Amino acid sequence: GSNFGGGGSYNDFGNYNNQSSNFGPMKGGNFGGRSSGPYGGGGQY
Amino acid sequence: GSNFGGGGSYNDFGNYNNQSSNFGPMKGGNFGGRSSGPYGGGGQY
Amino acid sequence: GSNFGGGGSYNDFGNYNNQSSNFGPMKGGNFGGRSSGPYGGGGQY
Amino acid sequence: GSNFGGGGSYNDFGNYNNQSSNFGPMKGGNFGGRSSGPYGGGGQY
Amino acid sequence: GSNFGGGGSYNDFGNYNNQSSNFGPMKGGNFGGRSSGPYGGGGQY
Amino acid sequence: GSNFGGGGSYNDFGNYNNQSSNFGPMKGGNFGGRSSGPYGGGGQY
Amino acid sequence: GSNFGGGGSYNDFGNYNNQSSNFGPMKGGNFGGRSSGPYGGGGQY
Amino acid sequence: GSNFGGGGSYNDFGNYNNQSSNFGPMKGGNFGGRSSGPYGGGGQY
Amino acid sequence: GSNFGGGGSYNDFGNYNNQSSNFGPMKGGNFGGRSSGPYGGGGQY
Amino acid sequence: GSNFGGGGSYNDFGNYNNQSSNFGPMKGGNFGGRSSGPYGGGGQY
Amino acid sequence: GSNFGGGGSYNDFGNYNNQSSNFGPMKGGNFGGRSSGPYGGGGQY
Amino acid sequence: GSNFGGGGSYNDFGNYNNQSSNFGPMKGGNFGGRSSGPYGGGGQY
């Protein structure tokens, strides 16, 4: 009889995938991975 | 008799996929991965 | 009878993936990995 | 009967992956790894 | 009956990976590893 | 019945990896390892 | 004027997705990922 | 004028995803990842 | 005018993902990662 | 005019990911990482 | 005009990741890392 | 005009990661690191 997240627990556990593959010349970018707060994620500015 | 997220638990567990593949020259970007807050995700500005 | 995150515990445990592979010349960038706070993530500025 | 993060514990334990591989000449960068606070992550400025 | 992070404990224990491999000439950089505070991470300025 | 980080303990214990390997001539840099405070991490300036 | 896979090149570059999510008790398995050769893929025998 | 896989090159570059998430007790397995040769992939025998 | 895998080169460069996350008790296994040769991958026998 | 894997070169450079995270008691195993030869990968026998 | 793996060179350079994180009691094992030859990888026998 | 692995050179240079983190009591083991030859890797027998 074990509690597993019961109560008001905010239980966020999701798998996330960003995948990209290119044979030719890649000047651009695939910006992946979690981010939070204003302007999260990478790039120019 | 085990509780599994019972109660008011906000139980968010979803698989998310962003996948992209290109043979030619890739100047642009596939912006993947979770984000939150204003202007989340990468790119110019 | 063991509690596992029960109560108000904010239990965030998600797998995140950013993956990228390119045969040609790569001038651009795949910006991956967790970030938080203003302007999180790498790049010009 | 062992407590495992029960209470208000903010229990953040997620696997994060940034992976990148390129055969040609790589002038750009894959910016990975956790960051927090203003302008976290590496790059020009 | 052992407490394991119970209470208000901020229990942050996540695996983080930044990996990169290139056959050709690498002039650029993969900036990995934890950082905090303003402008964390390496690069020009 | 042993306390393990219980209370308000800020228990931060995460594995972090920065790995990079290149066959050709490497003029650039992989900047890894923990940093904190303004402008943490190495590079020009 | 750049060749991009021209000639007899067998150019196989397809995105493939296997995704599955279940709230209840999962005794079975979602067998995903590429396989080749006799009896490829996992399971009993 | 750069060749990009031209000729008889067998150019296989595809993104593959296996993702799975379950709230309840998981006795079974999601067998992912590339395999080749007889009986590739994990499981009993 | 640079050759990029041209000729008979077997150029295999694909991103592969195996990801899995479970809140309840996990007795089973997610068997990921490349394998080759007879009976590749882990498990009982 | 630089050769990049041209000729008969077997150029295998793929990113591979095995990731898994579980809140409850984990008796089983996620068997990841490359393997080759008979019965590659870990587990009982 | 520099050769980069040209000829019959078997050029294997791939990033591989095995990552796993668990809040509860872990009796089992995540068996990661390259292996070759009969019965490569760790575990009972 | 510098040769970089050209000829029949078996050029194996891959990053490999095995990472694992657990808050509760860990009786089991994460067996990482390269191995070769019969029964490579650690564990009982």
UniProtKB/Swiss-Prot annotation, chains A, B, C, D, E, F, G, H, I, J, K, L:
It is found in: Nucleus; Cytoplasm. This is Heterogeneous nuclear ribonucleoprotein A1. Involved in the packaging of pre-mRNA into hnRNP particles, transport of poly(A) mRNA from the nucleus to the cytoplasm and modulation of splice site selection. Plays a role in the splicing of pyruvate kinase PKM by binding repressively to sequences flanking PKM exon 9, inhibiting exon 9 inclusion and resulting in exon 10 inclusion and production of the PKM M2 isoform. Binds to the IRES and thereby inhibits the translation of the apoptosis protease activating factor APAF1. May bind to specific miRNA hairpins. It is linked to Inclusion body myopathy with early-onset Paget disease with or without frontotemporal dementia 3: An autosomal dominant disease characterized by disabling muscle weakness clinically resembling to limb girdle muscular dystrophy, osteolytic bone lesions consistent with Paget disease, and premature frontotemporal dementia. Clinical features show incomplete penetrance. Amyotrophic lateral sclerosis 20: A neurodegenerative disorder affecting upper motor neurons in the brain and lower motor neurons in the brain stem and spinal cord, resulting in fatal paralysis. Sensory abnormalities are absent. The pathologic hallmarks of the disease include pallor of the corticospinal tract due to loss of motor neurons, presence of ubiquitin-positive inclusions within surviving motor neurons, and deposition of pathologic aggregates. The etiology of amyotrophic lateral sclerosis is likely to be multifactorial, involving both genetic and environmental factors. The modification Phosphoserine is found at residue 35. It comes from Homo sapiens (Human). Identified in the spliceosome C complex. Identified in a IGF2BP1-dependent mRNP granule complex containing untranslated mRNAs. Interacts with SEPT6. Interacts with C9orf72. Interacts with KHDRBS1. Interacts with UBQLN2. Interacts with PPIA/CYPA. Interacts (via the RGG-box) with the HOXB-AS3 peptide; the interaction inhibits binding of HNRNPA1 to the intronic sequences flanking exon 9 of the PKM gene, preventing inclusion of exon 9 and promoting inclusion of exon 10 which suppresses formation of the PKM M2 isoform and promotes production of the M1 isoform. (Microbial infection) Interacts with HCV NS5B and with the 5'-UTR and 3'-UTR of HCV RNA. Residues 26-44 have a biased composition (Gly residues). The gene is HNRNPA1. Sumoylated. It comes from the Eukaryota.
